[PDB]
Structure formats: C-alpha cells, structure tokens
Paper text:
Human ATP-binding cassette transporter subfamily B6 (ABCB6) is a mitochondrial porphyrin transporter that uses energy from ATP hydrolysis to translocate the heme precursors protoporphyrin IX and coproporphyrinogen III from the cytoplasm into mitochondria for heme biosynthesis. ABCB6 is a Type IV half-transporter of 842 amino acids with only one transmembrane domain (TMD) and one cytosolic nucleotide-binding domain (NBD) with an extra N-terminal TMD (TMD0). It functions as a homodimer with the substrate transport pathway and the active site of ATP hydrolysis built from residues from both chains. Within the transport pathway, a conserved aromatic residue W546 located in each monomer plays a pivotal role in stabilizing the occluded conformation via π-stacking interactions.
Notably, in the post-occluded state, we observed strong electron density within a hydrophobic groove formed by the elbow helix, TM 9, and TM 11 of each monomer. The density shape corresponds to a phospholipid molecule with two fatty acyl chains. Therefore, we constructed an atomic model of the POPE (or 16:0-18:1 PE) molecule in the head-down orientation as a representative phospholipid model. Our analysis revealed that POPE interacts with highly conserved residues across species. Furthermore, given the presence of a similar lipid density in the pre-occluded state, it is evident that a phospholipid bound to the TMD groove acts as a ‘wedge’ to stabilize the occlusion state of the transporter. Collectively, our findings suggest that direct protein-lipid interactions contribute to the increase in the relative stability of the inward-facing or occluded states. Structural analysis suggests that the lipid inserted within the TMD groove may compensate for the W546A mutation by acting as a molecular wedge to resist conformational transitions to the outward-facing form. In the lipid environment, however, the transporter predominantly adopted the post-occluded state irrespective of the presence of the W546A mutation. Formation of the post-occluded state after substrate release reorients the TMDs closer together at the two-fold dimer axis such that the central cavity is no longer present (lower left).
Numbering used by the authors:
A (entry chain B), B (entry chain A): 238 to 827
Write the structure that this text describes.
C-alpha cells in the first residue's frame, strides 16, 4: 500500500543524529548553518546582474562601474554551480562531514554481523550462502548513501521553489507569481500518477533476479564433483538460458523510466513559454523596463535546472531502496531457542546426567526419537550401538541444547536444563564433532583455539596425547605450516587428530566422542584409547562406535533400533542372552 | 608508472563495437549522430537571446517580437539543461542504447564464469572463497559503467571548449579568445600535478581493505566450530579492531580530494574576473554594444559549469577503476596442466593399467611418492593397505591426471596418458570421492547427476543396488524431499549410499573406491560388497580399505609404508611369511 512507505522512511531517518558523543553533536549543527547561507546567495546573485546592466545603459565613469562588477564576480565564486555541485561554501562542508559518516557506518556494520551469529541452528542449515553474503556486503552502503541524498539534494531543492514564489509576488508583479505555482503543481501530479503504473513492473524483477544467480554460486562451492563427472558444460549452458529471461524483463522497466523522464520535460517547457511571452508584452506597453527582462531570464533557468538533473539518477536510487528493504527484513527475524530472563549459572559438582521420557519430532510428522530414559553414575563410560539411521547422534545434539524438546524432562546434576543460562551451560562440556573443519590458518593456531592463553608449552605437550607430535616435526617449517581452506590441503586423518587434540586441550568436565577411529588405521586407535584412558580417570564419558572393538570394556551398553531402546546391560551379560548384540558380535568376529 | 595507464585504457575501449550482428552495428551510428546535433545547439541558443534583447531596446511591433520569442523557447526545450542531463535530443538516445548495453553485459559474464571453471586443482585448493565471489560480481558492472562516462560525458565536454575558442576569435573581438585558452591550460596543469601526489595514498588503501574482511567471511562459513567452543565474542571484537585501522587511512584519501576540488575552483574564478572587467571597459569606450555584454554573460557560464559537476563524482570513478584492474588479473592467468596440441581419443579395449617407475613430489621439498610400479590384468580387484599418511590416495589422484608427474610413464591399455585428450580420457572412469558432498537440490535430481538422459525407471532400479530404495520410500514425500545445503541435512551414511548409487548409475569402464564402509554399520557392509561383486564381472577395480575383513578375497595386495612398496602377494601367502602384514592381521584379529 501507500503507507508502508512512510513507516520505512521513518526508520531511515533515525540514523542521522549521532547518539552519544557531544563533540559530534555539534558538527551536526554548523553543517546545517552553511546550508542556510547558500540558500540566500541563490537569490542575491541574480539581482546584482541587473545593476551592472542598468548602469551600463545610462552611462557612467570607469571607476564606479568597476567596483560594481567586482562584486558580482565575487559572489559567483562563493556559490558556483547552483544546488548539487561545488563552490566554496558547499565543499567546505564535505570536509566536515567525513567524520560523522564514519560513525554511522561502523555502528550498522557491527550489528548485521552480530545478529547473524546469534541466530539458531535450524535456520543456519537451510540458508543459501550466496545470498546471505550478498546482502551483508551491499547493505551497509545503502543507509549511508540515501541519508545523503535526502538531506542535501532533495530538501534543499524544495525550499528554493517556495522562496521563489514569495518573491516574484511581493517585489515584482503578481500574475508572474502564479505562472510558477501552477507549473510545480502539475509537475508533481504527473509524477505520482506515473510512478504507480510502473510498480507493477519493478516488483516482478527482483524476484527472478535472486533466482538467476543461485544455481551458479553453488557450482563453484562444490568444485570437485563438477569435475569428476566431467560436466563443465551442462553448467555453462544452463546459465545462458537464465541470463536471457531476466534481460527480457529489464527492458520493460528501463523504458518506463524514459517515458517518465520525458513527460516532465514538457510541463517545464510550457511554463517558460507563458512567462517569457507575457513579460515582453508588458514591456512593450511601457510597464516594466527592459532591465527587468533580464532578471526573469536568469532567475528562472537557475530554478528549473535542478529538476532536470535528477534525470540521470532515478536508475540507482531504485536499486539502493531495494537493498535497504532486504537488510531490514533480516534484522527482524527472531531466535528460536531463547533464554529465560532472570536465570542463574549452573552449579557443577560431579556431572550426573539423567533422561526422563523424552519425545522429539523433527518435521512434526513423525517421532524420530521417543521414549528414552537412562542414568549415568559419575565417573562411568556409556556406549551406544545400533544400525544406521537409528538416531544415535540426535541424543548428543539434544544434550547440548541446540533444539527444544516437546515433552519429558532432561536433568543434569539435579538441575533442569531449561532454566540455566546457555552461556554458563556450554562452558562445562567439550565435544569432538562428527566431521572436522579447520580455519584457513596455521596448525598451531588451529590447535590453540581450545583456550586462547596457553603458550607453546601446553600446545606441544597436549600434542603428544593424540600422537601427532612425532608426525608434525617431520613437516617443513614444523608447526608454522599452512593448512588451507576447510583443511582439505592437509590429509585425511590428522584433521581428526588435531580436533581431538583441541578437545583434550580444552579439557572439559564432561567429554563426548561421536566418532574417533573413522579414518585411522588399525595400528593407531589402540594407542589413542590407551592414552585417553589416563585422561578419562575422573570424567563422565559418552562414546559412540560402530566398530565393537572399542566398547568391549564399556561400563554400560545401550542398543537403539528406531529410537526406542531394545536392550541394555554389559558385554558378557548381553552375549549370554543370545540376542541381536550376540548375533552381530558373532557376525563381525566370524 | 605513467604508461601502463595506456594499455589499460586501450582494453576498456576494445568493447564499444558489437562484433557480429549487423543491425546493432547500425544503432551505433545513429546514436553518434544525435550527439553531433546537440553539440551544435549549444552555440545557437546563446545567440538568439541577444536578438530578443536588441529588438526590445529599439522598440518594435508586438507581432514581430512575438514570433521571435517563440524561437528561443523552443530551442531551449530541445537542448535541455546542458551537456550532462536530460532534454529531448538526448533522452531519445538513452532509449536506443538499452539494447547495446545488454550485448556487452553478457559476453563479459559468460567469460569470467567459464575461465573460473577451467583452472586446475592446485589453484582451487588455495583460494579464499570470500574474495573470488566478490571479484566476479562487482566486476561485470565496471566495464559497462565506464564506457558510459568516457563517450558521453568526457569526450563531449572537451569538444565544446574548442568550438568556443574558434568562435570568440573569428566572430567577436579576438582578444578575448586568449583569455579562455590560458585559463583552460592552467586548469589541466594543476589536475596532473595534484593527481600524482595523491596516488601515494590511494595505493595503500586497497591492500589493507581486502585483509580487513577475510577473518570475517570465514567465521560465517564454518559456523559449528564457533559454537561448540563457545567463542562468539572473541570474534566480534577482532572485527572491531580492524574496522578502525582502515578508517584511519581513508580520512587521508577522502580529504586530498577536497583539496583538488577547491584549487580548480580558483582557477576558473579568475577567468571570469578578467573577462568581465575587460568587456565592460570596451563598452565604455564605444567599441561594443550593451547587447554584446549579454552574450559574454551567458556563453561563459554555460561553458564552465559542465566542468564543475564532475566534482561530485571523483569518488566513484576511482572505485570502479580499482575493480576493473582486479578482474583483468584473473582473466590473465594460466592453466597448469594443459593439453598437448592435436591428440586424439583414447582407444579403449580392455582396461589395463601399468605404472613405470614414477617419481613425483608436491612442493619440491620432499618426495611424497617414489619408485612405484605395478600392473593389473583385465578383470581383477587390486587392494592397498598401509598406515595413515603413507600416500594411498595420491596414486588415485595421479591416475585421473589432476596433477602431473616428474619422471616415469603412465600407460593405460597400451597408450600413454600424457598425450591423449583429457576430455576423452575422463569419460571412461568413475570414482566415489573420499569426502561426500551433495548439491542443494532434491534427492532424485542429485542421484540423476550420473547421466542426464536417464529415466525414472532405471534410476529407481539402480537405487536398489546400494540398498537405499527400501529406506527412502519410508520418508514423507518419498523422492522429492530436500537434502539441504552440502547434504548436512540428510544423515551420516546415507550420503555415502547416495554417492555409491550415483557411481553405479554412471557405470564406467573402471571403478575405484577410496572409502565406502566408513559410516556404515557392520550389518550392511556385507550385503553391499556382495551386490558390488555382481557388477564387477568385466571391470577393473581398485579398492582401498583400512579394515582388512573386506580384502580377504582380493586378487592382489600391496603394502605402502612411506610411499615405498614393502611386500606384495595374496592373503595366505603373506600370512605364512610372518611379516608386517601378518603382524597387522594378528593385531586386528586379537
Ligand atoms: C522525512 C521528510 C521527507 C520530506 C520529503 C518527502 C517526499 C519527497 C518527495 C517525494 C516525491 C515522490 C513521491 C512518489 C515516489 C515515492 C517512491 C520513490 O521515490 O522511490 C520509489 C521507487 O521509485 C523509483 O524507481 C524512482 C525513485 C525516485 C522517484 C522520486 C524522485 C524524487 C522525488 C521527485 C519529486 C520531488 C521533487 C523533485 C526531486 C527532484 C521507492 O519505492 P516505492 O516507494 O515506489 O515503493 C512503494 C510504493 N510503490
Ligand atoms: C580513448 C581516448 C581518450 C581521450 C581522453 C583521454 C584523457 C581524458 C582526460 C584525462 C585527464 C586526467 C589525466 C590524469 C588522471 C588520470 C587517472 C584518472 O583519471 O583516474 C585515476 C584515479 O584518479 C582519481 O581518483 C580521480 C579520477 C578522475 C581524475 C580525472 C578526472 C577526469 C578528467 C579531468 C580532466 C579532463 C577535463 C575535465 C573532465 C570532465 C585512475 O588511476 P590512475 O590512472 O591515477 O593510476 C595510475 C596512474 N597514477
Ligand atoms: Mg551421526
Ligand atoms: Mg586418502
């Protein structure tokens, strides 16, 4: 509708006045003043011109005429090029604003890069990288740009037309003071009537646009596959057939503009005809002197120039508006798993975890995990075994509180999860992820990410827990070797080794291992678990392992089939029962 | 230096003539013409003004005066504001160019999205996503936004000054002429001197800029890690401390400009003073007439204003230059592993492979692979076993020819691979990668990527071989579900099952498996390898497996220690030897 526009402009205005620093809160006044003086000069230059022509007509000494001429030339210097150009009053402000603009830009940026890191997991696993980056880079340049064309080229221009009608009405004749008024009115009423009839087009451009780029920016973030299967053509072609349909529409909306920018010309044109013709009539009938026909020949032009100038800008102002809209959209989304106000930090003494009839659904259609309850005594290791797709990892994801349960209760150390602050909750737990990703930085700094204070001593010693010390030293330059983006450059298993080294360095109260021996050879896992046995002496540990050679000494064993527990107990007590665990053990060992 | 500018401009100008379609090769002439007419009207308006002032001075009938004024209110309509704005002999050109700025904004896009996909691996595993995207999205607007300010606002302006000096010399006094000439000369000699002094600054801005964004577009790609280990603040801060340095070094290059834009004002100023004083003097000494003063008071103002306007654009015309420079660099590089001239398709008959004393290195510091040779008969399944980091995957990488060798020879089916075209070579081999990635699309289209002409019936039949048909149908919406981005949405092992189904659908001449049973439970591996034994009836296979339970029936077994072959033979022939393979097998079996 035509009201939302208003709401939007209001918001953009809020970012002008700096809020916090007094000094700056002054520059924003002086600047305004210079704006004031220039408006006056605009109505004092034309007048002086009349004088230097009047005197010349009647004749006078070379002396008197001289001083007068100098005056005119001076004032032109202080205001050259009308509104929207250079000069000496104007450009003296563009040198006292550079500072304020750098206080608004920063603030906006460090706000669209904080929110993106507070949103929840569900949203993140569905975004389209391409877009979430385009929006965040062009966005911070929209707000600054517009706030500088709506306070320095629009509002000023408008004020001038008015000052004009006051004059040309109480200092010249009168009728002339009407010809100007009507012109403007029509100019406006021919803009609105047209701007609307165009919006039917601009709207159906943005949508197609954001979908004529996606596919592509997703065939460059997955290079390997587009090579193995030797495509590399199927792709280039598909693009061509999308850069065509988009173009077919922009023509429509890049021609409407030429129409709007031509109809306006006429309205202006007619105005000049009326005025010029009438003025001459009067001077013939001895009512206004010739001199005067010069004033109404300079003031006018210098008052209609601005309108026409905006003609070469309409194109951009549109684009900038669109981008602002998008950014603001994002800053209105809401986090899903929030925190309860008035919450206290967790009290950690032993580390006991208990589940109480938890039911969970992903897409509200089926229950992936349902009716699970277990208890772990402090200082004990629990293991989970089952077929693929049974829901093993969902329990670990839910313990860390990345999602919210629907029913039941989860309690640790006698305290429920839902009322303690997450920030204090996550400081007691460290987990090795299923897949390893490393920053595009050096291996030493990748290892140090567990805690940003330790010196090379601990990094070095902790490097011995995973058995990577004897391997890194053989590398050229030792621990300052590069890793590459996402860690693809390094190798296949030492990514897992450095991940487990990070976790060991962190040394949390409770340790959880999703997969640890996925990529290691059969002669390296043993040593790793032997080293880990000395570290897990007094810490609760949950381990998941498809291979059953690791949980033979597990303190407790659980079997998950389709999210419902099927049996439990130790190793030998499960073997004697002759159940599914015994069947799988026999199948694996013989 | 000051000559590179030359080569640069030459290129940006090699794009203003559609090279192909004829029709278009015409619009580019009529456009040029309209330019001509306008550059004339500019000297036929000031003149008419004088006439309507002379007549008024001496008196005349309302009739005659009337038919004169009309003229000076028509020519104004056609000319418009000036040399950089709207009108009616200008707009009519910006409506016949839209169709030529869309044949130069395509050709230059489907050329920076092709080259990025023919570069080789080394480069790719070392880029910085953040940047490569940017360079390729802002880049296609520079070369289409400068060609429009170097053939419609510069060259035109220059022509006008000259026409002015010709006149004002052979039609008016001829002494004034000198004034104009000198003024312009000085204007230029100041621009050149100042521009260079400034360059020292602009150069040291770009560099810091591209590095104040890296550690920021790389903490939004690897989201998980920035949560597990908490953080989420350590980051926001680092950003702030880098948005400060950049700023401090721009208030330098955003103030130099204000200086350059004030000096120029003075030079222009002086010119007007000289002229006016002189002209007035002559009119006193009876040489010119009042009428004449009016001409030298309108022509000048409309011959200097066009220049000042450029004062408010300098900012952008810099940024655009910088971006063009970068794009060119990318389009100026070179592929690493090219193809020998000529050459022909590979003559495949059976499927034999041979290695002949291959020595190769990665970074010229260490020898990753050295002294490797083997051979496979047409129909078996060689296997490789060894410790981690021994170089198992490098052999597979070197077969596909992603990198290149230093010595030795590689022969397939009797033909060396170094001369045969890679396009024909890579149509006979299909490999499941070590890490599985999926397109952000539906599962059916993702699994159809093996061959684009496949049908639903054969896709459904082939999905049964991997054992996933009985699993997908239980999902809601069946085969039209989403997999998210990169495939993190699906599961932990179903990605691997989908990848192996893709490979089976492709059905190449030679099959290679890096790791297939990494994420599968022990109850599903058997059925899978039994199913895979049926399709390898007449296809050579190479299999890598850390677990030795799937290699017991291998036709040939190799042991790779540190890239040097230690022993070879079958399974029982190696068990009796009592070597390292026997030790590993015992240790695994317990
Ligand atoms: C905070 C105080 C502000 C005081 C002044 C406010 C009013 C300023 C004058 C506005 C006159 C034009 C109003 C009608 C157009 C409004 C929309 C617009 O300007 O840009 C739109 C996009 O339109 C364009 O593509 C062209 C953009 C420029 C059009 C207006 C040009 C400037 C104003 C011209 C008249 C004012 C006098 C001359 C200014 C030289 C943005 O999207 P939208 O509002 O159309 O979307 C929702 C409604 N459909
Ligand atoms: C193909 C035929 C072209 C004919 C005309 C060619 C010459 C046109 C007039 C050029 C006059 C200015 C020459 C000196 C500046 C050249 C550089 C430039 O314009 O922009 C530079 C960046 O400078 C700026 O930031 C300001 C950009 C605008 C400066 C020139 C403004 C337009 C020309 C002004 C004089 C012409 C008459 C008035 C123009 C309306 C781009 O980088 P760089 O060349 O400095 O880097 C290597 C050399 N250091
Ligand atoms: Mg999992
Ligand atoms: Mg490997």
């Amino acid at each position: 509708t035509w009201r939302d526009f208003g709401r939007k402009l209001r918001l953009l205005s809020g970012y002008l006045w700096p809020r916090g620093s007094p000094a700056l809160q002054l520059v924003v006044l002086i600047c305004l003043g210079l704006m004031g003086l220039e408006r006056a000069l605009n109505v004092l230059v034309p007048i002086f011109y009349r004088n230097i022509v009047n005197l010349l007509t009647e004749k006078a000494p070379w002396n008197s005429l001289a001083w007068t001429v100098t005056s005119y030339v001076f004032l032109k210097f202080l205001q050259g090029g009308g509104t929207g150009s250079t000069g000496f009053v104007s450009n003296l402000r563009t040198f006292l604003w550079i500072r304020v603009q750098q206080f608004t830009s920063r603030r906006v940026e460090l706000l669209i890069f904080s929110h993106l890191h507070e949103l929840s997991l569900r949203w993140h696993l569905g975004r389209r990288t391409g877009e979430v980056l385009r929006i965040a880079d062009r966005g911070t340049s929209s707000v600054t740009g517009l706030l500088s064309y709506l306070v320095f080229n629009v509002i000023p221009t408008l004020a001038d037309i008015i000052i004009g009608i006051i004059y040309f009405s109480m200092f010249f004749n009168a009728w002339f003071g009407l010809i100007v008024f009507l012109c403007m009115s029509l100019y406006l009423t021919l803009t609105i009537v047209v701007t609307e009839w165009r919006t039917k087009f601009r709207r159906a451009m943005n949508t197609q646009e954001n979908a004529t780029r996606a596919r592509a920016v997703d065939s460059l973030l997955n290079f390997e596959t587009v090579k193995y299967y030797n495509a590399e053509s199927y792709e280039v072609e598909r693009y061509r057939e999308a850069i065509i349909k988009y173009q077919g529409l922009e023509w429509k909306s890049s021609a409407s503009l030429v129409l709007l920018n031509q109809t306006q010309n006429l309205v202006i044109g007619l105005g000049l005809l009326a005025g010029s013709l009438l003025c001459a009539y009067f001077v013939t009938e001895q009512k206004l002197q010739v001199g005067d026909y010069v004033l109404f020949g300079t003031y006018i032009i210098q008052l209609y120039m601005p309108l026409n100038a905006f003609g070469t800008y309409y194109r951009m102002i549109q684009t900038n508006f669109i981008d602002m809209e998008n950014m603001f959209d994002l800053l209105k989304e809401e986090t899903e798993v929030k925190d309860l106000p008035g919450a206290g930090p967790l009290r950690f003494q032993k580390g006991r975890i208990e589940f109480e009839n938890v039911h969970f659904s992903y897409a509200d259609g089926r229950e992936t995990l349902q009716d699970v309850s277990f208890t772990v005594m402090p200082g004990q290791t629990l293991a989970l075994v089952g077929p693929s797709g049974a829901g093993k990892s969902t329990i670990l994801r839910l313990l860390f509180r990345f999602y919210d349960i629907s029913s039941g209760c989860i309690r640790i150390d006698g305290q429920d999860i839902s009322q303690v602050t997450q920030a204090s909750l996550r400081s007691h737990i460290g987990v090795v992820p299923q897949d390893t990703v490393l920053f595009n930085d050096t291996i030493a700094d990748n290892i140090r990410y567990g805690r940003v204070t330790a010196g090379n001593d601990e990094v070095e010693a902790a490097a011995q827990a995973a058995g990577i010390h004897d391997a890194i030293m053989a590398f050229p330059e030792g621990y300052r070797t590069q890793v590459g983006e996402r860690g693809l450059k390094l190798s296949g298993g030492e990514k897992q080794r450095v991940a487990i080294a990070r976790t060991i360095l962190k040394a949390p109260g409770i340790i959880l291992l999703d997969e640890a021996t996925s990529a290691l050879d059969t002669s390296n896992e043993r040593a790793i678990q032997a080293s880990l046995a000395k570290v897990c002496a007094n810490r609760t540990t949950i381990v998941v392992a498809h291979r059953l050679s690791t949980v033979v000494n597990a303190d407790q064993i659980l079997v998950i089939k389709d999210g419902c527990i099927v049996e439990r107990g130790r190793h030998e007590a499960l073997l004697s029962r002759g159940g599914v665990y015994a069947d799988m053990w026999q199948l694996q060992q013989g």
